[PDB]
Paper text:
In contrast to its eukaryotic counterparts, bacterial HSS synthesizes 1 mol HSP from 2 mol PUT.
The electron density at the active site of subunit B is interpreted as a hydride transfer from PUT carbon C4 to NAD+ carbon C4N representing a “transition-close” state of the oxidation at carbon C4. The nitrogen N2 of PUT is coordinated to Asn-162 (center amino site). The polyamine nitrogens (N2 of PUT, N06 of HSP) are bound with a non-optimal off-center geometry relative to the center of the 6-membered (benzene) ring of the respective Trp-229 side chain. The binding position between the inner amino site and center amino site will be referred to as the inner (binding) site, whereas the binding position between the center amino site and outer amino site will be referred to as the outer (binding) site. In accordance with the observed electron density distribution of substrate bound BvHSS, a hydride transition state with a partially aromatic nicotine amid ring and a positive partial charge at PUT carbon C4 seems probable. Thus, DAP can compete against PUT for both binding sites explaining its reported competitive inhibitory effect.
Residue numbers in the entry:
A (entry chain A), B (entry chain B): 3 to 477
Amino acid sequence: DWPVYHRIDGPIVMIGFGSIGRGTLPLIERHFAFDRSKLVVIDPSDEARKLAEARGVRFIQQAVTRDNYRELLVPLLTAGPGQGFCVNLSVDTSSLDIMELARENGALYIDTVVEPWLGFYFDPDLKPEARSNYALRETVLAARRNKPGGTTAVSCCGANPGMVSWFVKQALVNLAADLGVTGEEPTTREEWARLAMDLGVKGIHIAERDTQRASFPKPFDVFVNTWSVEGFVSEGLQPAELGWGTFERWMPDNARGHDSGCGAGIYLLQPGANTRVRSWTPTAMAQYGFLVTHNESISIADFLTVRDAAGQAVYRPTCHYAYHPCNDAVLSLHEMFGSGKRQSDWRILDETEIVDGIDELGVLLYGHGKNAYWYGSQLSIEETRRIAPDQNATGLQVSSAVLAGMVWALENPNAGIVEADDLDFRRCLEVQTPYLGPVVGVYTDWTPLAGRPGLFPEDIDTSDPWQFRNVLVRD
Amino acid sequence: DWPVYHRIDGPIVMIGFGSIGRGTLPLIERHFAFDRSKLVVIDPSDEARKLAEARGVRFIQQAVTRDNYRELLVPLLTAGPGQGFCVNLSVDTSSLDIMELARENGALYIDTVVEPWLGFYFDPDLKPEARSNYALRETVLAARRNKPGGTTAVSCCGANPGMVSWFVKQALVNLAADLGVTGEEPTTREEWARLAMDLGVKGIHIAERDTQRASFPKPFDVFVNTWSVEGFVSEGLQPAELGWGTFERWMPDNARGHDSGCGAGIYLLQPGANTRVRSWTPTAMAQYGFLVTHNESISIADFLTVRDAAGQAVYRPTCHYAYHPCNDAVLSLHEMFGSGKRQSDWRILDETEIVDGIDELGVLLYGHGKNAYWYGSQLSIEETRRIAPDQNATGLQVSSAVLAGMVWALENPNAGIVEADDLDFRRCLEVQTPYLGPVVGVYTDWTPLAGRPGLFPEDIDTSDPWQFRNVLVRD
Ligand SMILES: NC(=O)C1=CN([C@@H]2O[C@H](COP(=O)(O)OP(=O)(O)OC[C@H]3O[C@@H](n4cnc5c(N)ncnc54)[C@H](O)[C@@H]3O)[C@@H](O)[C@H]2O)C=CC1
Ligand SMILES: NC(=O)c1ccc[n+]([C@@H]2O[C@H](COP(=O)([O-])OP(=O)(O)OC[C@H]3O[C@@H](n4cnc5c(N)ncnc54)[C@H](O)[C@@H]3O)[C@@H](O)[C@H]2O)c1
Ligand SMILES: NCCCCNCCCCN
């Protein structure tokens, strides 16, 4: 039957029971051993309560707030007998504060985003940099520096951020192998970074194309997506952000750097979900992606940084999201930005509504000798329905990643605060791959300068096709 | 009991039998007296032939080219017994040359676009300026100066260009009534221009929202539209163009003017269908439109120009398209520009495939004492099917405009080369209105500054809400 990877010897506290929580619960029940009364879900939504009740799980209908999270979570996470697991799959809660709470009390932790307490994302009195994922991530890195070691807490371990970090490692190994480069795999951050440098990887797109669609057309004045609408709009309205490669010779006028932190990123003074980049996936071939800020855009570029003895970065790949969401979400963005306000209503397409499609999600490594290499999942809604309940393909890539992170955390429970880039990528993918559908590596000769210049003057660098100058849409 | 307006006692030569030809023929049959054998349809496609044969109409399966159009069309236009009518609804043919040919042979002429011979729109040797609708229109104006008066030829008399010119006049009349401006209704171009100036009309959007959708979702790698795909893509890849108002205080860096001609327009060095503008319609409320070049953008601005004794323009409204096509077309544009090439295939949604929706098409007059006024048609597909065969709502707005133009031409056959702006707008709308569904005027307090600036610094002009600086979306 299904593998049972581990016994959880304590409370399992799932915060949030939206599209991801709903998809993750069945995997937790499937793959871990524990008494049913150990698991409890926390979510303020009536919709969520009704679904939870239907699934026969304990449910606390409460919003976790700055004011109550200590009083609520400390007792639940320390119920016993042994180590509990905080599975944080929420919006509007502080990943940092909850993470630190769990660690203080010896509870394992995992989430899929560095979320802030409600009132951050759309605070007009915060400058764009202060609303950046770069900034949010730095609070986690600072927490790690302040308290090294201790109980394992896994930050940003969903599909992307999360799984894609493992894909990058696998892709690097595949590229090397395809070039006839043999020998031991890297085992340290420094060795991974040097592998990327040595193979001449100039940059990386998180290259995604979601082709899922419903039996009904997009309703007017309704934002439609295959996962969190609130979450997508939140990051969509954050500044465009990207890990910034050492090979880049140009940046936009409204690009800005950071005075502090790991040094791996820049941001643009414009919303990422209204910023387009030229990208590519196997099924989409050439496409527009949206340059939506994402944790991995920074974490991957940071991870793969090579520094000299003075500590100056000598190599680093460009890294960023190039997101083509489902067609109804594309229309939803057009509608939202076109009106200058969020729609009156929203909905997440679920399994019962989606007629066909895949969530093609992978990493596009470019600039090396074989030009460009896409590695990732082509999971279809059809396969999803066969192998996991209560979610679509988008949800399953995420929930299975949380599963992998949980297994890893349980197996490595004294590793301290860790990112997806810190995990054993082979073990994680071993656990996750049964839920990822086709996992393939594809080379292409496409570049951002394909068919260019066109009928109008363009600001392009023909000496280096993958320069951000050629990727960013400026029309 | 449909009205039969006039007898056409000469040959009726329809060039092109696509979506508009198919919608227009039955209106010609319905509203004109003539012997059915004197109608001839010319179109190179097999699809066209089979539709024409099904209607028992004489058909010539030939592409009209610069090499054959004289020897092909002259005998058809002059067949007698009386004055013929060339109804040009084609692509890839020269409106100018065919128009001049008709005029030379005493035949009436009408079309819906200043189309060039095949090889013009995507000619890499042409400068962007030469590819502009401004330039193409100047060839018609030059033809009129060279041969003033004579047989009537109606240039660009579809829905837009065409009908919307009449909408502008009606809107100006309504606005004057609502604003308490007293006087005789204008009866010359000078008086119309003066009225617009006196009412304080800063600019005009051709503000359109097409909500038609089919029983099937958009297919991958197929461009979908509700009218000509070839036609729409052609103008979509022409430079963005607009009639340029005297009130404008700013233009983008890649804006350019013209050294000669009527002087009413500028163009941008970027494709119009990948240029977004902030606009508004009654059903859409605030929306993105695409700044696709259109003849009326220049012709309306030119028509409403006030000049001093020296010949300098002292008033002129901004005028341009703000097009939100059907959702499948929005997706098609995203797909096309995203891949950097036209889709492998295309289809026009017809009356058998469309489930619901309207083509909300009107003119948005702004800058005056009541901020903004939208006047136009909200024709639905349901209403369309009730009153006209073989076309969707988009097609009927066009075909009925051609009908009106044809009635006008027959009633004024010695008026020379004329634009929609030169026609008796009341007579034309009298003929067209039965086919336009609700025709309404709607005020709004919305402006392009509404809700701005947001979370990011924006390059706006807070002093004058309707400045192009605020309307244009700047990637
Ligand atoms: N890294 C990745 O690949 C992905 C990450 N995510 C993230 O995971 C989180 C969940 O995503 P979805 O389940 O799709 O979102 P969703 O919008 O479907 O559900 C979010 C849930 O959080 C609940 N919630 C709101 N305020 C709360 C509070 N104060 N305390 C507890 N719960 C609260 C809501 O009631 C809702 O049920 C989001 O933060 C999202 O950004 C989502 C998908 C992919
Ligand atoms: N002003 C307006 O409101 C308006 C709106 C819609 C379309 N139009 C214009 O009307 C024209 C027709 O639109 P449509 O939707 O019917 O287009 P369509 O693409 O459906 O049909 C065009 C037809 O032209 C024919 N054709 C191609 N080359 C030809 C040639 N050399 N000689 C004769 N025929 C040829 C094709 O076979 C096709 O049947 C286009 O130029 C379009 O831009 C104007
Ligand atoms: N803040 C959440 C962002 C991470 C992406 N989340 C959802 C997955 C959608 C794309 N697979």
